[PDB]
Amino acid sequence: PPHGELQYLGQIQHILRCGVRKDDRTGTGTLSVFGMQARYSLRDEFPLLTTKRVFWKGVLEELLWFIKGSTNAKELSSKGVKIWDANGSRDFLDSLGFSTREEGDLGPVYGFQWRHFGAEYRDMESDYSGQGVDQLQRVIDTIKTNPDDRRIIMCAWNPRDLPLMALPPCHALCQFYVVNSELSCQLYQRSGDMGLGVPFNIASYALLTYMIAHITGLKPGDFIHTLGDAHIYLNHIEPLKIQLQREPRPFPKLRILRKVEKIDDFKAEDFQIEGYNPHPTIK
């Protein structure tokens, strides 16, 4: 019965052995392979990497933040997760050109894209209800009425809204799949920081799958992860070499205590990870 984390650790083995140098927007060089796909099981397990601590409080905290549609990093920075705030700051904010944007305004990110697609973006405080298109719900719905639908997709990438967001989504699209009352998900990430980012995503979208299988009375299945430019920065090569050695521990279990009906009602206090024992630190 092979372990899930070997899938992730394995992809790293590959990137290191065959990855070619490639710089980014900041020109920083990285080793990189293009086009990958891992399949983590969600069956009474939770793919929260064990060869290194994963920011669970962030994973959760941010996920709900999206569900809320909130597109103001200042509405998450106060939730105890400062992994966006630097995108709303006057400096970088105005730096992008939107010098006329309010401090904390990230723009049309996932949140607004998951509930108000195509919706003319006004502001991070502007009312958008009935405004646009909400796929997060439409996804939920379809699952319920016709789970055979092989077009239960939820795109967050918007060519129109692209040159207006704090930064393009690394999450192109995710299409849900249902068979034998099990809820499978496939996420398509365009870019992927196998070092300090990818693991945080495996969680984030394993979580959502768990939340929806909940609401829909479905049962968690397989979470397929597909990447375009899979890379790792050079700083990380050394650390990852060691972590590459650590043996993967048993994936924890995710349990929701309060039975919820409206996905929009879910609350941070509604989940509790039990059994998360990652390895100390590496650096």
The binding site consists of: 25, 150-151, 170-171, 190-193, 201, 231-233
First to last CA, the chain: 31
- Find tokens 């996804």 and name the residue: 139
Q: State which residue, 50 or 158, has the beta carbon closest to its own copies.
A: 158
| Cα 167 to Cα 113: distance, rounded to the nearest angstrom | 13
Return the number of the residue (18 or 242) whose C-beta is nearest its own copies: 18
For position 7 contacting its own copies by CB under 8 A, the verdict is no
CA–CA distances in Å: residue 107 to residues 28, 62, 205: 26, 16, 22
> Which x/- pattern, by CB under 8 A, does the window 182-201 give for its own copies?
--x-x-x-xx----------
The DSSP code sequence of 81-142 is: --SSGGGTSHHHHHHTT-TTSPTTB--S-HHHHHHSTT-----SSS--TTSS--HHHHHHHH
Residue 102 touching its own copies (CB under 8 A): no
Q: Does 16 bind its own copies (CB under 8 A)?
A: no
Q: Which residues ranging from 23 to 62 are in contact with its own copies (CB under 8 A)?
A: 23-25, 32, 34-37, 39
Q: Is 228 in the site for its own copies (CB under 8 A)?
A: yes
Contacts of 25 (CB under 8 A, 6+ apart): none
Stretch that binds its own copies, among 55-63, 203-211, 224-232, 236-244 (CB under 8 A): 224-232
For its own copies, give the closer residue by CB, 145 or 281. Answer: 145
b/e code 155-178 from CB counts within 10 Å (16+ = b)? bbebeebeeebbebbbbbbbbbbb
| Catalytic (active site) residue 170 | yes
Restricted to residues 230-249, the positions that interact with its own copies (CB under 8 A) are: none
Sheet holding 29-41, edge to edge: 20-23, 29-41, 219-233, 182-193, 171-179, 153-155
Q: Does 135 bind its own copies (CB under 8 A)?
A: yes
224 within 8 A of 31, measured Cβ to Cβ: no
Our finding on whether 177 is near its own copies (CB under 8 A) is yes
Least distance from its own copies to the Cβ atom of residue 271, Å: 25
Catalytic residues, by residue number, are: 170
Which residue ranges make up the site for its own copies (CB under 8 A)?
A: 20, 22-25, 32, 34-37, 39, 117-118, 133, 135, 138, 148-151, 153, 155, 157-160, 168, 172-173, 175, 177, 179-180, 184, 186, 188, 190-191, 222, 224, 226, 228-229
